[model samples]
Target chain A: LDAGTIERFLAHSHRRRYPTRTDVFRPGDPAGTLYYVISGSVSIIAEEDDDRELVLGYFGSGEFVGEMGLFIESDTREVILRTRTQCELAEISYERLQQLFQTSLSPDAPRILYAIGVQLSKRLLDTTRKASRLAFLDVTDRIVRTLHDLSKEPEAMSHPQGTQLRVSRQELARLVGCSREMAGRVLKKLQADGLLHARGKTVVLYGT
Target chain B: LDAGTIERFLAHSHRRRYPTRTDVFRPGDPAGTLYYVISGSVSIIAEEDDDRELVLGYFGSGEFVGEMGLFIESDTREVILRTRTQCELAEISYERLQQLFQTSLSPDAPRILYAIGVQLSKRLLDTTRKASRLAFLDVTDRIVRTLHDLSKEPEAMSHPQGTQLRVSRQELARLVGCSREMAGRVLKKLQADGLLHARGKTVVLYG
Candidate 1:
């Protein structure tokens, strides 16, 4: 919220700033409060163990996190949220939300709930689309498609020759549900074709 | 919304009845109205072509469909929803929904919106969980898992042997995102082990 009513939201709303590599949320954390990201980004990961983590999604500024928890009676988190960089967040607790549910509801409650529904629905649509991609797409296509989409992010870096995507072969592989070596092989082939090159741990993709 | 304020909702809301095999909603149809299933079931299908259709989900009674279209500017349907059996549906139009939103909102508006949010969030949770399952599970495990889930639905049939899962080898394959042959092979393996047996197209899964 950046405008009038938006400013009213953060008037006494709790904000927390976390440094890089902070484990802002873990799988078992209480889902009592939803995070409204004021700044930076957090990677949502599904943890199999300390040894294995699959990135479920990413949330950046002006986005809502922990919303799926708001409606669940289980009231606990299922994914891990770690700061991708230094971050700032506003916590909207379930208690505060419920207070707005009565007949004399706050003016902001419906708008905020509608926004949350929209966000949640958006995530559902994206997840369903990606799930089908996993079903219908081959590994090579998954890797290429993932990288192509990643370049659209505002944080994506630009190289002199092309667009730079900041992801490791392993991270790319995990994101696309493939093995690291397979992702590397595809990257190696793409690099050989001169469609892309690696520099400073970033894969630079050309218009090819 | 089974109680008081809910009665006020359907007082003037639109409802439709369709016989079995009706293509109630299809891809590219305007997502202007959300459907509340008053009775019977509808299968949500993602169509590849007339020749290929994948079952994404099945919504039975007391569930909402076409909700994702409510907030998008480019409001259009993506999945094709076909009635599994004779069905009754309540259509809530976007225009009516927006009229409820204003400086002085109806008492029912926030409640209904919250309900819709809860449903969407539940679907999101299920979809995300199922998506990760696709990433982590093999064809055999996926088949078993999908069947296990299907057994929980209210309409699932019971067999004298065990639980009857009403899905064909082809339907089962697409539900779990695999080939029919592969799914059949796995079903064969499971039947050979006496864990499951196909009876009149329904797979009777044993304990």
Candidate 2:
């Protein structure tokens, strides 16, 4: 989204704050509110229990969540959303959204919806791509590609020379749908070859 | 979609026909057209070559394909689409779709886009569900569920007591991402248990 458009839309939204690790919504939560992240990031997780959780994706500032609920009749959260950092958010109510679409008073409303649609479409494409990978790619290749994806994250590039990932071994395993011990073994091999450094939870990628 | 809405939309489309086993489009083909299945079924298959084709899903009448290309710039097909049976298709060009969105002269245009979006969302959800199953379920369980899904086909249910799958063992192996030998072994085991009968290429499930 452009600066002026997001700013204008935020004018109508109520600014809210959430601390790190706070759940913004859980499965079965009523979906009256649509959240736009102003700062920080959140993880969209699918979980059956504490031990069984899958990381679907992550969203950062300028991204919106809960648009799926806006379209579905029941309008309930299917996955758990939790803040990964202390964050600022703009909350838009369903009633306000309907009014925006009906009145067309705010020219930005359709653009906002279009942006959400684009995100949803992109996520769908990515999920399909992931399914293809699960069907074809082995665990080692999956871990390599996942690390490469993490290295491209602009938000995690704290150092000038390398990219740092603030992820635990178990989380990396979960992302690739593999065992943590297997992930640890692969990480150790990568570290030995000087491609990356994995100490405890942090993995840093060097030399592009 | 309602009858009138579909009828009105089809009025603009140019109808095309294909015999069984005709290739509608191959991977890397330019994404300039969207196809609506009007009277027959088509298969969406993921393939690397003639030897590695995996059946992703099937779309029967009333379902559409190639909507993803409408939204994507320079969209090329990633999968192969082929006629599983004699098919009647309504083809809509990209220019016509753009005009529909822009003019909005037809009240059904937005509804059509909405319907496409809903289908895309549902497919995404199902693909994710399949991914979880692949991650968690063993081959036997996966085959059982795949058989259950295949059994729901009314056209293939030849016997009153059980459903028959008009599929080759190689195809089942592709669907489950396993070796043909492994699938054959499992099918033979099931046959011994009297759960199914595999003779030649066709596997018949008997109660």
Candidate 3:
């Protein structure tokens, strides 16, 4: 760890907690801070044309959010985040991030920048791949890959018999870039096929 | 400009020259250095199974000949570049670029980085838009934007156009995500439309 960079970043960094349901930042706000989600779940939502809130994705531990606007160059926030559960987050201003690079801490600054770059590029590629796969790949293939990628012990995922995913059917649909009805139908189909079983909030894999 | 960064980069930088018909770098060459086109035109060729070359785009003074590969992280060169005329190039190494960033420069060393970010993002959006327009805009809009973007003057372009383009038609096709025949037909259409009038050895665009 680069002490200088990390110290400055941590010194300026502050954490906040949100209740079960609250807005983190509204649709439009200055993008001067980079956020790190520490705990709990937060769902990014957008208003559909018919004027209904639609879930885009959920952020959990070890996840990042609030960067798409930076690349788009517009202050118009496309998504509003709501805490699905109690949430804790760490936030650092862009100025502080800049100080990490502009000061004596500059020497090892590439590591952080490289991480940011990798995350951003991966997000873009993942989004493109998701869109492509949803339109083309088999539903089972998409679900299998999604489950494996989401799981901590992916190789142990013999089936989705009782896998507990902390998300709603509508939310799952949005993340998979599909319709809620389709998501429910797929969930039901997988359940009937003995591939997985979802009981309320908990899903379990029985094969393994 | 941070003189240290420039010097470090220059230490890694190399110069190469090419005659009217030669390749400066082909596909699959080590993508170590960022090639800065100092002079002349280099056409990016996309090769197909039939040995056809698509002319995607041309790079002139101060622009990069092969930057997309560096940006996209593709190890194998997607397009082949041939010199349109006699050319001079400066190749800046990737390690040197990283070294500069890691050593003296730092990531946020500049408002310049923000500007670069903005510029690159804008280009991505503009390129996407340009590609979208391909369905109806014909070869004219494409040439107009390319010329306006590349040219340095209100009159004669500071960089004179040369040859069919150092890149073959197929390579051009790959860069623009089109076919070789389509790229050639587009070039011919541009010449015929007088947007760019082609002479024996050069194509000059309207000032």
Candidate 4:
């Protein structure tokens, strides 16, 4: 997705603005419209237990969502698209999406659809891997993996105390969606297992 | 995806045959060729622990696989593609795939590409949901759900022997890929809990 692709679609598309934290589309909603994020963020999501939504991916400026809907008809959407920020979206109806094929003269039609296909495939690849991890890797495994990943980041510092991750405890918890109940127990469990060393003010990254 | 789409691509494509249980593409293989299953079956597979292969989906006659490779240039494939039976497949090279996009005059180019795109999106939709289930649902939950589904099938007949599934214990076990030890224990556990009743030989289905 680029400026030209967004421009071509926006030329005749119904550009609409949605406020922050808006529900652009939800589960079982009619997937009859495609949205191009002219500005702001629209998250591709799934709802799990405890009413928490899983953010699979996001569509930002010059990107698209529900392009799959353009190819499909009369199907309810399986995923949710909620706006994270005040979003300007160029809404493309199914009729026009169909018309794009009929209007063969529109040179960018094939390119646009191809882009959408690539987007879908890329997402499928990433999500499939993550799903496998979730299935096979437990919470402790994930915490260590997250710690390992964060440790690889340049922000990590080797201090006399430990490898300080530089992020505050609360912030790090929020980053991993870890609650004090499970986080405390799991972190202690990890520490007990010698997979990690817990620090109060800052996360001490231990060797995984 | 369709005869017309397959026909356009197979115009100059190479047709190859493989014996049953052939590994056409394994993990980390260069994803360069798009395959249309001319005959037999090609399964999209993934490997889990204990050398077990997870059959995600299959491509049969008039269907295609690796259509995503047409768009990508250089990337190693994540999933494995194996021949479920003696298979005949029309292999479309990436060069030709790129040419189909470039050919411009080929009236079928956009339609063919569109078909591939639709195939991709549909696969994405199915796989994503299955992935969620694998992540959330436990083995016991899956077994009950599978039982529920099998029970709903027309093959399941209600008789004095209970709702007979018309299969043996071994058959049901194979259908679920359940191990003898685990299957025995779980079935007994389920039966002990009155969730089910285990039967030998005929798999006398007691609700």
TM-scores for all predictions: 0.91, 0.83, 0.54, 0.75
For residues B115-149, write the lDDT of model 2, one tens digit per residue.
Answer: 66666666666566666556656778778778877
**Tens digits of per-residue lDDT for model 3, B1-207:** 254634444455688877887886776776666676777877655454455443434557655445443345766654467887799887866666556655654533343234334334443334323323332234545445554544433323343443232234544444444555776777788778766664443446554
- lDDT by residue for model 4 (A94-185), tens: 77777874774256766777777777777777665555555555666655666666676555787664576654444344333444346567
Residue A99, candidate 1: how far off, in angstroms?
Answer: 2.5
Q: Backbone clashes per model, in order?
A: 0, 0, 25, 0
Model 4: lDDT of residue B22: 90
lDDT of 3: 0.55
Query: Which candidate ranks first by DockQ, i.e. highest?
Result: 1
How good is model 3 by TM-score? 0.54
Residue pairs that clash (backbone atoms under 3 angstroms), model 4 = none
Query: For model 1, what is the alpha-carbon lDDT of residue B41?
Result: 88
- DockQ order of candidates, top first: 1, 4, 2, 3
Name model 1 segments beyond 4 Å from true.
A47-52, A103-105, B49-52, B103-105, B159-161
- Report the TM-score measured on chain A for model 1: 0.88
lDDT ranking from best to worst?
1, 2, 4, 3
Query: How would you encode candidate 2's per-residue C-alpha lDDT over A17-53 as one tens digit per residue?
Result: 9999998998889989888989998987666433456
lDDT of candidate 3 over A86-185, digit per residue (tens): 9988787666666666775465454454444444443333332343343335555666666545554322333434444444676556555456677778
Give the better candidate number (1 or 4) by DockQ: 1
Kindly give the stretch of ten consecutive residues in candidate 1 chain A with the minimal lDDT sum.
Answer: A96-105
lDDT of 1 by residue, B1-207 (tens): 656656566655688899998997788887788788889988877666334565778887767788777776656798888998899998868777677554233776677788888778777776776676677678888788788889887767887877888888888877888888898899989999888888546898885
Q: What is the DockQ (computed on Cα atoms) for candidate 4? A: 0.40
Question: Candidate 2: where are CA atoms >4 Å away?
Answer: A1-16, A23-39, A47-51, A61-78, A87-116, A156-162, B48-51, B104-106, B152-166, B193-207
